[PDB]
Design a protein around this motif. Structure first.
Motif, short mmCIF file in Angstrom:
data_model
loop_
_atom_site.label_atom_id
_atom_site.label_comp_id
_atom_site.label_asym_id
_atom_site.label_seq_id
_atom_site.Cartn_x
_atom_site.Cartn_y
_atom_site.Cartn_z
N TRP A 1 0.76 -1.60 0.10
CA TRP A 1 -0.45 -0.05 0.32
C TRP A 1 0.55 1.17 0.02
O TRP A 1 0.39 2.34 -0.13
CB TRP A 1 -1.19 0.03 1.10
CG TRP A 1 -0.17 0.06 2.60
CD1 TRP A 1 0.54 0.98 2.91
CD2 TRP A 1 -0.86 -0.18 3.61
NE1 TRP A 1 0.91 0.01 4.45
CE2 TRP A 1 -0.47 -0.25 4.46
CE3 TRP A 1 -1.80 -1.89 3.84
CZ2 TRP A 1 0.27 -0.89 6.33
CZ3 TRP A 1 -2.41 -2.74 5.11
CH2 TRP A 1 -1.71 -2.08 6.19
N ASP A 2 1.55 1.05 0.29
CA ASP A 2 3.06 2.17 -0.73
C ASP A 2 2.42 2.17 -1.70
O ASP A 2 1.86 2.00 -3.01
CB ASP A 2 4.80 1.95 -0.65
CG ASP A 2 5.49 2.70 -1.17
OD1 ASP A 2 5.07 4.30 -1.53
OD2 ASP A 2 6.56 2.93 -0.87
N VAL A 3 2.84 3.87 -2.37
CA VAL A 3 1.86 4.83 -3.92
C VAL A 3 2.93 3.88 -4.30
O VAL A 3 2.99 4.97 -5.85
CB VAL A 3 1.46 5.79 -3.65
CG1 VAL A 3 0.50 5.41 -2.53
CG2 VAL A 3 2.57 6.41 -3.37
N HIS A 4 4.17 3.99 -4.78
CA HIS A 4 5.45 3.56 -5.39
C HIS A 4 5.22 1.92 -5.86
O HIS A 4 5.05 1.06 -4.54
CB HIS A 4 7.05 3.67 -5.27
CG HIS A 4 6.75 5.33 -4.49
ND1 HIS A 4 6.43 6.00 -3.93
CD2 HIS A 4 7.99 6.25 -5.69
CE1 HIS A 4 7.11 7.21 -3.39
NE2 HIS A 4 7.66 7.43 -4.77
N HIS A 5 5.56 2.00 -6.91
CA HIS A 5 5.18 0.69 -7.37
C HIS A 5 5.96 -0.83 -6.81
O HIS A 5 7.79 -0.09 -7.70
CB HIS A 5 5.22 0.31 -9.04
CG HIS A 5 4.63 -1.26 -9.30
ND1 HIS A 5 5.52 -2.09 -10.43
CD2 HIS A 5 3.18 -1.93 -9.38
CE1 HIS A 5 4.83 -3.13 -10.37
NE2 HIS A 5 3.88 -3.16 -9.68
N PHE B 1 3.85 4.78 3.92
CA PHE B 1 2.91 5.42 4.88
C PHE B 1 2.72 6.93 3.99
O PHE B 1 2.84 8.10 4.00
CB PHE B 1 2.68 5.83 5.94
CG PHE B 1 2.63 4.71 7.15
CD1 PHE B 1 1.12 4.06 7.08
CD2 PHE B 1 3.77 3.72 7.20
CE1 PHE B 1 1.87 2.74 7.38
CE2 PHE B 1 3.72 2.53 8.39
CZ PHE B 1 2.44 1.96 8.48
N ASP B 2 3.40 6.89 2.75
CA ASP B 2 3.76 8.04 1.71
C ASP B 2 2.16 8.43 1.00
O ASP B 2 1.90 9.48 0.27
CB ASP B 2 4.49 7.63 0.50
CG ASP B 2 4.93 6.81 -0.36
OD1 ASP B 2 4.03 6.50 0.70
OD2 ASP B 2 5.98 6.92 -0.65
N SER B 3 1.75 7.34 1.19
CA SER B 3 -0.04 7.69 0.48
C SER B 3 -0.83 8.08 1.81
O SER B 3 -2.36 8.14 1.53
CB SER B 3 -0.65 5.48 0.90
OG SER B 3 -0.40 4.98 1.86
N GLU C 1 8.01 0.94 4.56
CA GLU C 1 8.52 0.65 3.35
C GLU C 1 9.40 2.37 3.03
O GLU C 1 10.17 3.27 3.35
CB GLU C 1 7.82 0.25 2.29
CG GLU C 1 7.34 -1.15 2.06
CD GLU C 1 8.40 -1.63 1.25
OE1 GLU C 1 9.74 -0.66 0.95
OE2 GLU C 1 8.68 -3.28 0.50
N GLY C 2 8.20 3.25 2.87
CA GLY C 2 8.34 4.75 2.65
C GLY C 2 7.60 5.06 3.58
O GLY C 2 6.71 5.00 4.55
N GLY C 3 7.60 6.64 3.63
CA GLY C 3 7.22 7.36 3.99
C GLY C 3 7.35 8.49 4.18
O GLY C 3 9.06 8.03 5.00
N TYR C 4 7.52 10.06 4.32
CA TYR C 4 8.27 11.29 3.65
C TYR C 4 8.23 12.34 5.15
O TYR C 4 8.84 13.22 5.17
CB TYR C 4 8.83 11.49 2.73
CG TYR C 4 9.77 10.28 2.75
CD1 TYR C 4 10.22 9.82 2.21
CD2 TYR C 4 8.68 9.60 1.37
CE1 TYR C 4 11.13 8.32 1.49
CE2 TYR C 4 8.84 8.76 0.41
CZ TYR C 4 9.78 8.02 0.50
OH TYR C 4 10.52 6.62 -0.41
N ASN C 5 6.56 12.68 5.28
CA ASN C 5 6.74 14.19 6.23
C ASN C 5 6.96 13.62 7.64
O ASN C 5 5.85 12.65 8.19
CB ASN C 5 4.76 13.97 5.71
CG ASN C 5 4.53 15.98 6.18
OD1 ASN C 5 5.53 16.22 6.11
ND2 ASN C 5 3.36 15.74 6.16
ZN ZN Z 1 7.01 4.59 -1.78
#
Ligand code: ZN
Ligand code: FKS
Ligand code: K
Ligand code: K
Length: 607
Positions: free
Chosen positions: A172-176, A265-267, A303-307
């Motif tokens: 559910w990260d928004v990068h494939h 969690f960049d989603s 995985e991701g999340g940047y804010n």
């Molecule tokens: Zn991502």
């Protein structure tokens, strides 16, 4: 199975971008420190079994990577800055550090430790706060911000060391996660779902394989699901419509033995690289809707999340539901946007050749049980039992007002269980129904409960109306009972325990989530078909903050009812219903998608 694991180590926060690179400036070590400190502040990390981090042996790294590439990164700790950024340019959008190869081995070893803890029943589920990420790296290339594919490790690791045939991967990260897809492209063992920001290939990584077109190759076709977001700003209704209409239907028929998620969690709203509008609490429901799968064995991997100022909000919402804490009500739900409905329409069609449920017609105690007085059951230490002069006066007030028996114990308990919930939920075995159902919600509507969800299995009409917009009735019968009121839903062989599920994911759950009830009221009659009531009771706990009152009329059913109310693991079902049964569903999906837009899985026809 008992607790929940949380694997983390501050050492993975000791490597950073050592030059100017606008591609990776968003990837900072502070992502890992704020996520743990957020779990620490809210009193969450202390409630999870902290499994220590280990290194991943090169025997395990070659499960998903080549020797030529592992030896290439094994030489990175000896490179200086001039040599490091030269090696980082041979790959796309990634940076290397003197310590990154050491941390990457801790990155895989952290998830593998989580896999062992979940599969050895040491814990029920878990989460790995881990850096660097994973799902971009391939068999012999670093890509994105990742070095080794953390959850692709876990899949082949669980495939090898546990002989598991069906592993569901959610990303559910928004990068494939192209590294996941490539690894299991021709592999039907691992079902890979992935929604991602696409913008018609406009967005990184700009891959054609990221589109809904790619379903798999060879024998693995059907087990790769890409849901491309083509416009930014997707909301909670967009994300939930995805789960309800593509991921959850094939997940329960996949019937996975282990679910692994690529937690990005960049989603969430506020992230600069995702640019979506989903609130952090939507992740509390994403995990919860996945718990009935694999008997709860779920290994979350970061995985991701940047804010940084909002990344911690969603990592706690993930752990909140991981521990079984009540999920927050989601307000403002409705129809998915037109582009989301366009994407869900496309991949549903392309996947329809495999998952045939997509075909279309041509155009601290948290439960209380009051069982028949005198009975004593074995309750899982988070339950209780039974009136009072405060309550009896109300039962006496209602006694002569609208209506002798021992059912006045049914009512005195029914009042006090509701007074106590407004404890999380409860359940009561009842004598006569109509008086028990009437006294239940009529006392609940004035608790106050703004709106009341009502689910009832059995035949005939129950004793309450659905005229105003403060009540909604769900019912499963043997007869037709063709209704006209929109604030209602009536439904209906050996296919019952298999077609009821996709009618719960595709119909019952979407309308309820848009309804946003203050209390769920479950009712069944004596009349059974029991193999499914536990799966239902588990997934509505995502609504009304978990407050649900069940009224059984009792058999062995009670033991399984309280099972899901208490938060215990839920039995898998094993892996397609009748044609006349799904004609029943779309005859009421077209009827109800007017008021409740979350039922829609296609773009509306313009008039
Ligand atoms: Zn991502
Ligand atoms: N604005 C410029 C950034 C362009 N480079 C793409 C970054 C990839 C994001 C990686 C990720 O978020 O998917 C992960 F989960 F792996 F961390
Ligand atoms: K993804
Ligand atoms: K696959």
């Amino acid at each position: 199975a008992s607790g929940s694991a949380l694997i983390f180590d501050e050492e993975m926060s000791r490597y950073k971008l050592l030059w100017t690179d606008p591609a990776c400036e968003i990837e900072v070590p502070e992502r890992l420190t704020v996520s743990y400190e957020a779990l620490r502040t809210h009193g969450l990390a202390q409630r999870c079994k902290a499994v220590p981090v280990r290194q991943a042996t090169e025997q395990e790294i070659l499960l998903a990577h080549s020797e030529e590439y592992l030896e290439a990164v094994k030489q990175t700790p000896g490179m200086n800055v001039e040599e490091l950024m030269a090696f980082s340019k041979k790959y796309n959008d990634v940076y290397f550090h003197q310590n990154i190869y050491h941390c990457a081995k801790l990155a895989a070893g952290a998830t593998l430790q989580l896999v062992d803890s979940v599969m050895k029943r040491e814990v029920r589920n878990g989460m790995a706060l881990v850096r660097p990420p994973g799902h971009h790296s391939q068999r012999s290339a670093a890509n994105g911000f990742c070095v080794f594919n953390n959850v692709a490790f876990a899949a082949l690791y669980a495939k090898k060391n546990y002989n598991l045939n069906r592993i569901l991967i959610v990303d559910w990260d928004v990068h494939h996660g192209q590294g996941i897809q490539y690894c299991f492209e021709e592999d039907p063992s691992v079902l890979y779902f992935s929604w991602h920001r696409y913008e018609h290939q406009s967005f990184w990584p700009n891959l054609p394989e990221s589109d809904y077109s790619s379903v798999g190759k060879g024998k693995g076709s059907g087990f790769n699901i890409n849901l491309p977001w083509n416009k930014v700003g997707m909301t909670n209704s967009d994300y939930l419509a995805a789960f309800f209409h593509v991921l959850l239907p094939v997940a329960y028929e996949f019937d996975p033995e282990l679910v692994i998620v690529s937690a990005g969690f960049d989603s969430a709203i506020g992230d600069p690289e995702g640019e979506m509008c989903a609130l952090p609490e939507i992740f509390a429901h994403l995990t919860h809707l996945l718990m009935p799968l694999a008997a709860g064995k779920m290994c979350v991997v970061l995985e991701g999340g940047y804010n940084l100022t909002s990344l911690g909000q969603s990592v706690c919402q993930t752990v909140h539901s991981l521990l079984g804490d009540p999920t927050p009500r989601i307000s403002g739900l409705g129809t998915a946007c037109d582009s989301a409905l366009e994407s869900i329409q496309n991949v549903r069609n392309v996947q329809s050749s495999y998952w045939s449920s997509f075909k279309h017609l041509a155009q601290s105690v948290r439960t209380v049980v009051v069982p028949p007085p005198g009975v004593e059951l074995t309750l899982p230490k988070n339950c209780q039992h039974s009136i009072s002069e405060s309550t009896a006066k109300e039962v006496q007030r209602i006694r002569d007002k609208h209506f002798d028996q021992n059912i006045l114990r049914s009512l005195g308990n029914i009042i006090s269980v509701l007074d106590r919930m407004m404890v999380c939920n409860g359940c009561v075995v009842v004598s006569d129904l109509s008086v028990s159902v009437q006294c239940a919600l009529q006392h609940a509507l004035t608790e106050p409960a703004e709106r009341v969800l009502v689910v009832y299995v059995g035949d005939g009409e129950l004793p309450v109306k659905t005229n105003d917009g403060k009540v909604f009735l769900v019912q499963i019968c043997t007869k037709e009972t063709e209704d006209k009121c929109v604030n209602r839903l009536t439904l209906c062989g050996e296919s019952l325990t298999a077609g009821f599920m996709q009618a719960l994911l595709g119909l019952i759950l979407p309308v309820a989530y848009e309804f946003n009830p203050a209390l769920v009221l479950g009712i069944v009659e004596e009349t059974r078909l029991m193999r499914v009531w536990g799966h239902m009771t588990c997934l509505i706990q995502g609504l009304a903050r978990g407050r649900m009152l069940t009224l059984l009329q009792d058999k062995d059913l009670l033991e399984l009812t309280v099972s899901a109310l208490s938060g215990a693991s839920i039995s898998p079902l094993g892996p397609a219903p009748k044609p006349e049964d799904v004609e029943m569903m779309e005859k009421q999906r077209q009827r109800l998608q007017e008021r409740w837009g979350l039922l829609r899985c296609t773009v509306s026809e313009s008039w």
